[PDB]
Design a protein around this ligand. Structure first.
Ligand code: HEM
Ligand SMILES: CCCCCC/C=C/[C@@H]1[C@@H](C/C=C/CCCC(=O)O)[C@@H]2C[C@H]1N=N2
Ligand SMILES: CCCCCC/C=C/[C@@H]1[C@@H](C/C=C\CCCC(=O)O)[C@@H]2C[C@H]1N=N2
Ligand SMILES: CCCCCC/C=C\[C@@H]1[C@@H](C/C=C\CCCC(=O)O)[C@@H]2C[C@H]1N=N2
Length: 445
């Protein structure tokens, strides 16, 4: 029987013994945590599957709290998730030497080269023939499926240097990946039913084979990002089978957000003609588009930054009140709920307004009840630990949007359509994914 100690957050066990709020937290994390915020405020502790999870939603505390890596561990949870989702183990892996390299390969001159290759690869994949325009003037597709297809294939070819895969082989990989990706949330939660466990297992196995071209004598490039990664695993005594499985882990890490983000960007522009105009005008340093991307990320970048509490920690909210986390609990931080979707910070937060971050110049002054908000949106995580793939991802999103808007005419099938609702299963996992899709048609401009 867990009991609240002095200055611990509000405690909400739910009614189901042991299990607590696990189901509901899992089904839709935004709805459930919003519910709890309303009930309890900016900090509260929830029971889920025998564990107690403290959630911090006071955005000005995020950095200072998360900077404390002595009290807050990413690694052990990442292990469990790695096992549950990717059917993977990496005994004796040092995550530190590979965190450093991920940061170096995706910035500076290293990023310039990858971005160049990304551009070249996107051009190869946006040929009339690649766009399915060999049979008619117009081609019907879902905007989401199209945006993911194009960025997945570009990211893949660029980051893995997998030109060994032909046009139809890339389509097969993407489609298999999608079956895996679709199931990744349930898989992360251990909520997979019989059929879904089999589909997941089947997709993983095809991908493990396809992503490592075993039969080919392709000398590894050990100075590349992916090559140095495999070499490290090999030097750590990690067997060939696990190397093969790490490829699917690295595929998700690098390809599972950008295409989806580009979908939302395009979705919002196609449904907001004034935003589309201001972007199209600009396409002839891009302050407008910058704002459009940042708005899109406010609405759809929903990582649930999670940590295990390794030691008791005293924590302070903006009002000065003090709370105690206890060793063995989890801590979650959710910038989606606040600041991104906080109505006291961004008025009408459910609405896409392209200029939200433009003055009458970048808008940088934001407030909650007269308090300065340093970070009005937090898609890349916290200032101490910013996503190392962000510059690459933004480049890629720009490149797709630019290209589509310039070389294609793209129309919504239903003239009055809006962007689909969000598939709530996605909250916590990065860029959100549409419930259904946005039906479009396109042609060579
Ligand atoms: C729209 C695109 C993306 C978004 C919104 C996003 C979001 C995030 C967030 C919020 C974190 C912080 C995780 C944490 O603190 O626990 C993170 C970390 C990370 N991201 Fe991304 N990401 C994106 C794209 C990418 C891409 C394209 C790559 C690879 C090229 C990538 C690689 C990584 C890696 C390796 C980390 C781990 C940092 C660490 O904890 O050591 N991400 N991402
Ligand atoms: C505890 C899980 C840590 C996972 C560390 C690997 C980072 C993965 C990033 C992901 C962002 C994280 C989303 C929520 C993961 C939970 C967390 O990092 O606390 C996706 C893929 C890549 N960029 N975007
Ligand atoms: C939502 C995220 C789910 C994907 C799982 C993320 C996996 C994260 C691993 C992290 C730590 C996991 C295991 C390290 C210990 C290896 C072991 O003993 O199995 C970092 C980055 C990657 N490898 N090291
Ligand atoms: C990685 C963040 C996205 C996950 C979406 C929410 C799902 C599961 C967990 C939440 C609790 C909900 C169910 C507990 C089952 C997870 C487990 O067995 O570890 C919070 C955040 C994560 N760990 N604690």
């Amino acid at each position: 029987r867990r009991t609240r100690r002095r200055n611990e957050p509000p405690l909400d066990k739910g009614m189901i013994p042991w299990l607590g709020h696990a189901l509901e937290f899992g089904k839709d994390a935004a709805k459930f945590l919003t519910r709890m915020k309303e009930k309890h405020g900016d900090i509260f502790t929830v029971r889920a599957a025998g564990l107690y999870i403290t959630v911090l939603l006071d955005s000005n505390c995020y950095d200072a709290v998360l900077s404390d890596v002595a009290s807050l561990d990413q690694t052990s949870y990442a292990q469990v998730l790695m096992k549950r989702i990717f059917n993977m183990i990496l005994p004796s892996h040092n995550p530190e030497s590979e965190k450093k390299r991920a940061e170096m390969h995706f910035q500076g001159a290293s990023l310039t080269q990858l971005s160049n290759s990304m551009q070249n690869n996107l051009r190869l994949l946006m040929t009339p023939s690649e766009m399915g325009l060999k049979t008619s003037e117009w081609k019907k597709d879902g905007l989401f499926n199209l945006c993911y297809s194009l960025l997945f294939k570009t990211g893949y070819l660029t980051v893995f240097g997998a030109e060994n895969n032909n046009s139809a082989a890339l389509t097969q990989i993407y489609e298999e990946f999608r079956r895996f990706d679709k199931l990744l949330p349930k898989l992360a939660r251990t909520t997979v039913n019989k059929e879904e466990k089999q589909i997941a297992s089947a997709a993983r196995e095809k991908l493990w084979k396809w992503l490592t071209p075993s039969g080919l004598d392709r000398k590894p490039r050990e100075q590349s990002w992916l090559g140095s990664y495999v070499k490290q695993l090999q030097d750590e005594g990690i067997d060939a089978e696990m190397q093969r499985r790490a490829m699917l882990l690295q595929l998700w890490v690098t390809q599972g957000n950008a295409g989806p983000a580009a979908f939302w960007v395009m979705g919002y522009l196609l449904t907001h003609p004034e935003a589309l105009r201001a972007v199209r005008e600009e396409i002839q340093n891009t302050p407008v588009f910058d704002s459009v991307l940042w708005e899109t990320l406010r609405l759809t970048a929903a990582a649930l930054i999670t940590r295990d509490v390794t030691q008791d920690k005293k924590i302070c909210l903006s009002n000065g009140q003090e709370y105690h986390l206890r060793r063995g609990d989890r801590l979650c931080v959710f910038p989606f709920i606040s600041p991104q979707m906080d109505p006291q910070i961004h008025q009408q937060p459910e609405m896409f307004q392209f200029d939200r971050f433009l003055n009458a110049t970048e808008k940088k002054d934001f407030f909650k009840n007269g308090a300065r908000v340093k970070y009005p949106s937090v898609p890349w995580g916290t200032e101490d630990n910013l996503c190392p793939g962000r510059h690459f991802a933004v480049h890629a999103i720009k490149e797709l949007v630019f290209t589509i808007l310039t070389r294609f005419d793209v129309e919504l099938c239903d003239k009055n359509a809006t962007v689909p609702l969000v598939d709530p299963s996605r909250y916590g996992f990065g860029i959100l994914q549409p419930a259904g899709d946005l039906e479009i048609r396109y042609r060579i401009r």
